[PDB]
Enzyme design. Structure first.
Site, PDB file in Angstrom:
ATOM      1  N   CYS A  97       0.815  -1.213   0.000  1.00  0.00           N
ATOM      2  CA  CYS A  97       0.000   0.000   0.000  1.00  0.00           C
ATOM      3  C   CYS A  97       0.846   1.258   0.000  1.00  0.00           C
ATOM      4  CB  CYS A  97      -0.924   0.019   1.230  1.00  0.00           C
ATOM      5  SG  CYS A  97      -1.913   1.524   1.310  1.00  0.00           S
TER       6      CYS A  97
ATOM      7  N   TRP B 116      -9.094   6.402  -0.747  1.00  0.00           N
ATOM      8  CA  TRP B 116      -9.455   7.170  -1.929  1.00  0.00           C
ATOM      9  C   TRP B 116      -8.479   6.743  -3.005  1.00  0.00           C
ATOM     10  CZ3 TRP B 116      -8.301   9.820   2.675  1.00  0.00           C
ATOM     11  CH2 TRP B 116      -6.966  10.221   2.823  1.00  0.00           C
TER      12      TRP B 116
ATOM     13  N   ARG C  94       0.000   4.593   2.922  1.00  0.00           N
ATOM     14  CA  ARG C  94       0.088   4.341   4.358  1.00  0.00           C
ATOM     15  C   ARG C  94       0.471   5.527   5.239  1.00  0.00           C
ATOM     16  NH1 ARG C  94       3.957  -0.514   4.850  1.00  0.00           N
ATOM     17  NH2 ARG C  94       4.419  -0.011   2.639  1.00  0.00           N
TER      18      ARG C  94
ATOM     19  N   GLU D 196      -4.717   4.068 -10.822  1.00  0.00           N
ATOM     20  CA  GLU D 196      -5.525   2.871 -10.639  1.00  0.00           C
ATOM     21  C   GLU D 196      -6.663   2.812 -11.654  1.00  0.00           C
ATOM     22  OE1 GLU D 196      -6.094   1.522  -6.335  1.00  0.00           O
ATOM     23  OE2 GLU D 196      -5.778   3.685  -6.063  1.00  0.00           O
TER      24      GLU D 196
HETATM   25  C1  HEM Z   1      -6.508   6.544   1.921  1.00  0.00           C
HETATM   26  C2  HEM Z   1      -5.884   6.519   0.745  1.00  0.00           C
HETATM   27  C3  HEM Z   1      -5.269   5.230   0.145  1.00  0.00           C
HETATM   28  C4  HEM Z   1      -4.536   5.215  -0.977  1.00  0.00           C
HETATM   29  C5  HEM Z   1      -4.184   6.435  -1.861  1.00  0.00           C
HETATM   30  C6  HEM Z   1      -4.141   3.845  -1.218  1.00  0.00           C
HETATM   31  C7  HEM Z   1      -3.395   3.400  -2.273  1.00  0.00           C
HETATM   32  C8  HEM Z   1      -3.241   2.084  -2.629  1.00  0.00           C
HETATM   33  C9  HEM Z   1      -2.883   1.592  -3.951  1.00  0.00           C
HETATM   34  C10 HEM Z   1      -2.632   2.442  -5.223  1.00  0.00           C
HETATM   35  C11 HEM Z   1      -2.807   0.262  -3.879  1.00  0.00           C
HETATM   36  C12 HEM Z   1      -2.493  -0.699  -5.041  1.00  0.00           C
HETATM   37  C13 HEM Z   1      -3.840  -1.335  -5.371  1.00  0.00           C
HETATM   38  C14 HEM Z   1      -3.795  -2.108  -6.653  1.00  0.00           C
HETATM   39  O1  HEM Z   1      -2.896  -1.831  -7.495  1.00  0.00           O
HETATM   40  O2  HEM Z   1      -4.666  -3.002  -6.812  1.00  0.00           O
HETATM   41  C15 HEM Z   1      -3.119  -0.139  -2.520  1.00  0.00           C
HETATM   42  C16 HEM Z   1      -3.139  -1.430  -2.046  1.00  0.00           C
HETATM   43  C17 HEM Z   1      -3.489  -1.810  -0.773  1.00  0.00           C
HETATM   44  N1  HEM Z   1      -4.009  -0.990   0.231  1.00  0.00           N
HETATM   45 FE1  HEM Z   1      -3.966   1.088   0.218  1.00  0.00          FE
HETATM   46  N2  HEM Z   1      -4.644   3.039  -0.211  1.00  0.00           N
HETATM   47  C18 HEM Z   1      -5.352   3.858   0.650  1.00  0.00           C
HETATM   48  C19 HEM Z   1      -6.020   3.402   1.771  1.00  0.00           C
HETATM   49  C20 HEM Z   1      -5.936   2.148   2.344  1.00  0.00           C
HETATM   50  C21 HEM Z   1      -6.613   1.713   3.555  1.00  0.00           C
HETATM   51  C22 HEM Z   1      -7.549   2.628   4.387  1.00  0.00           C
HETATM   52  C23 HEM Z   1      -6.269   0.427   3.786  1.00  0.00           C
HETATM   53  C24 HEM Z   1      -6.675  -0.531   4.939  1.00  0.00           C
HETATM   54  C25 HEM Z   1      -7.321  -0.150   6.050  1.00  0.00           C
HETATM   55  C26 HEM Z   1      -5.380   0.014   2.712  1.00  0.00           C
HETATM   56  C27 HEM Z   1      -4.787  -1.230   2.568  1.00  0.00           C
HETATM   57  C28 HEM Z   1      -4.250  -1.728   1.396  1.00  0.00           C
HETATM   58  C29 HEM Z   1      -3.870  -3.106   1.168  1.00  0.00           C
HETATM   59  C30 HEM Z   1      -3.941  -4.298   2.149  1.00  0.00           C
HETATM   60  C31 HEM Z   1      -3.354  -3.151  -0.261  1.00  0.00           C
HETATM   61  C32 HEM Z   1      -2.844  -4.383  -1.025  1.00  0.00           C
HETATM   62  C33 HEM Z   1      -4.125  -4.926  -1.660  1.00  0.00           C
HETATM   63  C34 HEM Z   1      -3.844  -6.172  -2.451  1.00  0.00           C
HETATM   64  O3  HEM Z   1      -2.819  -6.836  -2.170  1.00  0.00           O
HETATM   65  O4  HEM Z   1      -4.657  -6.494  -3.359  1.00  0.00           O
HETATM   66  N3  HEM Z   1      -5.217   1.080   1.856  1.00  0.00           N
HETATM   67  N4  HEM Z   1      -3.375   1.002  -1.784  1.00  0.00           N
HETATM   68  C1  LIG Z   2      -5.175  -8.716  -8.165  1.00  0.00           C
HETATM   69  N1  LIG Z   2      -5.622  -7.317  -8.106  1.00  0.00           N
HETATM   70  C2  LIG Z   2      -7.028  -7.283  -8.544  1.00  0.00           C
HETATM   71  C3  LIG Z   2      -7.567  -5.864  -8.445  1.00  0.00           C
HETATM   72  C4  LIG Z   2      -7.926  -5.481  -7.015  1.00  0.00           C
HETATM   73  C5  LIG Z   2      -8.469  -4.092  -7.063  1.00  0.00           C
HETATM   74  C6  LIG Z   2      -9.120  -3.679  -8.213  1.00  0.00           C
HETATM   75  C7  LIG Z   2      -9.625  -2.384  -8.309  1.00  0.00           C
HETATM   76  C8  LIG Z   2     -10.258  -2.085  -9.390  1.00  0.00           C
HETATM   77  N2  LIG Z   2     -10.862  -1.809 -10.342  1.00  0.00           N
HETATM   78  C9  LIG Z   2      -9.488  -1.505  -7.237  1.00  0.00           C
HETATM   79  C10 LIG Z   2      -8.819  -1.926  -6.087  1.00  0.00           C
HETATM   80  C11 LIG Z   2      -8.654  -0.978  -4.911  1.00  0.00           C
HETATM   81  C12 LIG Z   2      -7.263  -1.037  -4.275  1.00  0.00           C
HETATM   82  C13 LIG Z   2      -7.296   0.155  -3.340  1.00  0.00           C
HETATM   83  C14 LIG Z   2      -7.757   0.011  -2.034  1.00  0.00           C
HETATM   84  C15 LIG Z   2      -7.807   1.113  -1.197  1.00  0.00           C
HETATM   85  C16 LIG Z   2      -8.302   0.948   0.226  1.00  0.00           C
HETATM   86  C17 LIG Z   2      -7.411   2.356  -1.692  1.00  0.00           C
HETATM   87  C18 LIG Z   2      -6.962   2.465  -3.010  1.00  0.00           C
HETATM   88  N3  LIG Z   2      -6.565   3.653  -3.532  1.00  0.00           N
HETATM   89  N4  LIG Z   2      -6.925   1.370  -3.796  1.00  0.00           N
HETATM   90  C19 LIG Z   2      -8.310  -3.220  -6.001  1.00  0.00           C
END
Ligand code: HEM
Ligand SMILES: CNCCCc1cc(C#N)cc(CCc2cc(C)cc(N)n2)c1
Ligand code: HEM
Ligand SMILES: CNCCCc1cc(C#N)cc(CCc2cc(C)cc(N)n2)c1
Ligand SMILES: C[C@H](O)[C@H](O)[C@H]1CNc2nc(N)[nH]c(=O)c2N1
Ligand SMILES: C[C@H](O)[C@H](O)[C@H]1CNc2nc(N)[nH]c(=O)c2N1
Ligand SMILES: [Zn+2]
Lengths: 407, 411
Positions: free
Chosen positions: A106, A278, A109, A283
């Site tokens: 993420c 958000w 963070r 994305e």
């Molecule tokens: C608040 C603004 C946030 C931004 C800008 C953000 C940004 C991102 C982005 C760009 C990814 C890559 C997702 C992808 O490529 O599929 C990601 C993954 C992830 N985020 Fe964050 N996120 C936010 C909030 C959060 C919150 C609130 C949580 C948990 C409470 C979180 C937990 C995670 C986790 C566990 C992943 C890995 C997901 C996966 O492995 O599929 N994020 N985040």
């Molecule tokens: C193997 N990966 C499969 C895709 C998982 C995924 C897909 C989309 C979409 N569309 C959107 C998300 C959201 C990931 C995310 C989660 C949070 C909490 C914030 C943020 N900016 N982005 C995840």
């Protein structure tokens, strides 16, 4: 055993000690790196509870206190007696915030400590889940001024009474395999959509149909619910220069809300824990719109720009890519929906990393996921060495419930 | 054991068995992944099994495994190791070895070309003047008037570690960098330290933005000597843009021949500390990294201004926009001057086909995702969606310390 990470752009070197606390395994060995692979009892439970309570009590400056020992005592008794234990509200909130803090994939963070935690452990039915989720969506959306939130449903007991959100995200668009052989809507969601259809969803076979929630409470069969349309904030995508862009008919939803992960805290498993933040612009604009296996609109956009699509070397794909991403950011900003560009987000993450190294001794990070899917090396994270390792509390992947579910 | 890699765009799954032949360490453990870390005297004891492992591979590759020729060669090397504490490769083995070091280079996206490598055997070289001549010949051959040809020149192997051959340049052709008293840099900031060394060694610097550095060549462990590559051998390309006419007035150019000269070639336990090798450029190496890294020429701002982009907020993606136009210009300029170059779309598509071919015919293709995925437009290239397994095979190219940090000066 003490590891150094270097930034090759600034020459700043950080020393990681936090990885020593790590306990789960990476998939990598001394002979092979799997860094690019996407998915690589009472006696088991008490040391996990102990490890967690120790860090919790350390965090509140009460390590080795009577309140610490007493709590460890009470949890111990409860595991012996009941085979599980219940987290105090304070522990639940701490654990959820730290699961996010520990999420190595993420980039967002820096916000970790500002997470609104909704305790839904009193939920017993799918209708109750729907209510909690609508409230989460409304809270998190906040008329476009997004706020991070997680809603936590009851923990796993015997694995036979699992709470599960069957959807991968709270808000996504349907996909339908056509007779024309092409795909209508989001190709990513064809299988789930069919499951929605097998369960009785009346699909409106459109291109951007918000999927219904398929909610499973207490291991029972999943039930369908439509999120109130007025709570799903969506954004028509237009371009600030190209007046023709709106004619593509594109839109996206404002709230990214992951709903298929497992939250692990102190050995307890929360199989239903939807969380939301958000979007980062790429994305939607890079992955959702330009992935070959998603909406795949590169060609259409390139044509409207009248680019030379004869040869790859004209970089027509790259040109159209930038403009699509320009439109996404412009559209969200114009409609006042929170969004962050990849430059701002990665700069924030570097600051967060330096904060974490300074105040925690490190920050687990997966470079493969942290570097944005366009313009990688002009963002500061590209030049940043990162160490990836697994800390708990954590968000984990879990199997899709339909492969799991005994109907 | 079997390992599977998946392509998330095509759902094509491949099965790796080649990783079983892996020997060296990755840096990773079951507890930590060091996948994004840039940089994570040999006894007869350790030398014969390394020689034997290599000769077994070589003789298998020529379908002569277990032959009398194979057995006689093992015996010959064994006796040479016990007699002389080292051994000499046959020319055939050297060529096989160099081609396989390239085939095994997990950070290289250009490996589809590995079997077409011109190997220049310079093991009879004894002086820095001799090294200079070999290197000029390599540059001329490889350049081929713009129709680039991959090549490697191999100088004598390490013996006691006190008689190393070394090219002190990181690449055969690079531009000088000069730190100004006001803290600014003229030329390539990457090369400031090396430039200062060259100057101290007596190089008369023109002190311009694109001065080709002299070669600093060390033979047989002696102090390095300065040589200027004949300017007529250094092919350069003035950078201009197909639509924007002001781009030429940026004053940019770049050289055509990417030629790495600071790595160590290990074959059969032998160490070739001087083994310059060259191919042709992928556009983004110049247009993204060389021109746009904050720590290199750093021209995003000037370009962005001239395009009249909104530079008040990053959300305008002005950097991304200028980045694309610069990379268009690089490709356009090289193609127009008929100098070999490949775009990152072509190069990554070719790599995927190469990788799939390697899985079928070889049982694997070690690859470093972090390095393979291009520094712009990552996910619209097929490698972004391709799971890869990184492991180390020999023969191989390895990093070695910079010679100025280890050299014992003779004076
Ligand atoms: C608040 C603004 C946030 C931004 C800008 C953000 C940004 C991102 C982005 C760009 C990814 C890559 C997702 C992808 O490529 O599929 C990601 C993954 C992830 N985020 Fe964050 N996120 C936010 C909030 C959060 C919150 C609130 C949580 C948990 C409470 C979180 C937990 C995670 C986790 C566990 C992943 C890995 C997901 C996966 O492995 O599929 N994020 N985040
Ligand atoms: C193997 N990966 C499969 C895709 C998982 C995924 C897909 C989309 C979409 N569309 C959107 C998300 C959201 C990931 C995310 C989660 C949070 C909490 C914030 C943020 N900016 N982005 C995840
Ligand atoms: C023929 C065309 C070739 C192309 C298009 C190509 C492409 C590339 C690129 C883009 C990189 C990344 C460089 C960087 O980012 O610094 C690279 C690295 C590398 N290449 Fe290739 N290459 C080619 C030929 C060769 C040859 C002939 C060899 C050796 C015989 C070779 C061996 C390597 C090695 C060892 C690396 C890793 C360098 C390092 O770790 O710093 N390549 N290549
Ligand atoms: C830590 N990394 C420092 C930079 C290494 C490097 C820099 C430049 C430049 N400028 C050029 C190269 C050339 C790499 C290369 C080598 C070959 C043989 C072909 C090809 N297309 N590219 C390497
Ligand atoms: C195979 C490779 O690991 C896969 O394509 C990854 C690469 N990096 C990623 N990075 C992010 N943020 N999200 C992703 O889905 C992926 N996909
Ligand atoms: C820290 C990180 O490993 C470093 O910036 C890497 C990333 N990927 C790269 N990829 C290539 N081809 N070349 C590089 O120099 C780098 N640098
Ligand atoms: Zn690893």
């Amino acid at each position: 055993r003490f590891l150094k990470v270097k930034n090759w752009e600034t020459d700043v070197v950080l020393t990681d000690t936090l990885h020593l606390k790590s306990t789960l395994e990476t998939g990598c060995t001394e002979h092979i790196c799997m860094g690019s692979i996407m998915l690589p009892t009472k006696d088991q439970l008490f040391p996990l509870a102990k490890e967690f309570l120790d860090q919790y009590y350390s965090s509140i400056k009460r390590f080795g206190s009577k309140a610490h020992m007493d709590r460890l005592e009470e949890v111990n008794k409860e595991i012996e007696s009941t085979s599980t234990y219940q987290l105090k509200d304070t522990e639940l909130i701490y654990g959820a915030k730290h699961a996010w803090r520990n999420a190595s994939r993420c980039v967002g963070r820096i916000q970790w400590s500002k997470l609104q935690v909704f305790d839904a452990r009193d939920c017993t039915t799918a209708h109750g889940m729907f209510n909690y989720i609508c409230n989460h969506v409304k809270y998190a959306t906040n008329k476009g001024n997004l706020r991070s939130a997680i809603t936590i449903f009851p923990q796993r007991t015997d694995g036979k009474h699992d709470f599960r959100v069957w959807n991968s995200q709270l808000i996504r668009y349907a996909g339908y395999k056509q007779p024309d052989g092409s795909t209508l809507g989001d190709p990513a969601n064809v299988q789930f959509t069919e499951i929605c259809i097998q369960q009785g969803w009346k699909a409106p076979r459109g291109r951007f149909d918000v999927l219904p929630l398929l909610l499973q409470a207490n291991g029972n069969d999943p039930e369908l619910f439509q999120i109130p349309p007025e709570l799903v904030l969506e954004v028509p995508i237009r371009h600030p220069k190209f007046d023709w862009f709106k004619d593509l008919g594109l839109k996206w939803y404002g709230l990214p809300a992951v709903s298929n992960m497992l939250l692990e805290i102190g050995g307890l498993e929360f199989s239903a824990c939807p969380f939301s933040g958000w979007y980062m612009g790429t994305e939607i604009g890079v992955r959702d719109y330009c992935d070959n296996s998603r909406y795949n609109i590169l060609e259409e956009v390139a044509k409207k720009m009248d680019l030379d699509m004869r040869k790859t070397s004209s970089l027509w794909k790259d040109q159209a890519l930038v403009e699509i991403n320009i439109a996404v950011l412009y559209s969200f900003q114009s409609d006042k929906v929170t969004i962050v560009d990849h430059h701002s987000a990665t700069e924030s993450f570097i600051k967060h990393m330096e904060n974490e190294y300074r105040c925690r001794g490190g920050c687990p990070a997966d470079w493969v996921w942290i570097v944005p899917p366009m313009s990688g090396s002009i963002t500061p994270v590209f030049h940043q060495e990162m160490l990836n390792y697994r800390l708990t509390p954590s968000f984990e992947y879990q199997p899709d419930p339909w492969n799991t579910h005994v109907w």
